[model samples]
Target: LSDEDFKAVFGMTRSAFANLPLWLQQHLKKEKGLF
Candidate 1:
């Protein structure tokens, strides 16, 4: 995945990688695996 797409999925900005809500983040991360 492109960096921007990755960050957007986690609700992060261009300059920082913030920790997203764990349960929701985990869900999206899991969905990514299926794709």
Candidate 2:
């Protein structure tokens, strides 16, 4: 999902991003070339 979609569906803040599944976080960052 897109960042907006994720935040909306998961009710997550930028800080909460680190609290979820490691793979999910990796997917999100990998798409952005952030990992």
Candidate 3:
């Protein structure tokens, strides 16, 4: 992910992930398997 994307994920733009919900975060992490 680019810095912008990373910020969008967990930084100042954290609201962007608000619509995703925790389950989706976990699901996406599982899908990406990055960490």
Q: Considering every candidate listed, which one attains the maximal TM-score?
A: 2
Question: Using alpha carbons, what is the TM-score of model 3?
Answer: 0.45
List, in order, the clash count of every candidate structure. Answer: 0, 0, 0
lDDT of 3 by residue, 1-35 (tens): 77687675554344565567889777766765654
Q: Single out the weakest 10-residue window by summed lDDT for candidate 3.
A: 8-17
By lDDT, the best candidate is 2
Q: 1-35 in candidate 2: lDDT tens per residue? A: 67886677556776698886899887777766553
Instruction: Give lDDT per model, in order.
Output: 0.60, 0.72, 0.63
Q: Write down the TM-score of every candidate.
A: 0.40, 0.47, 0.45
Q: Which residue ranges in model 3 land beyond 4 Å of their true spot?
A: 5-15
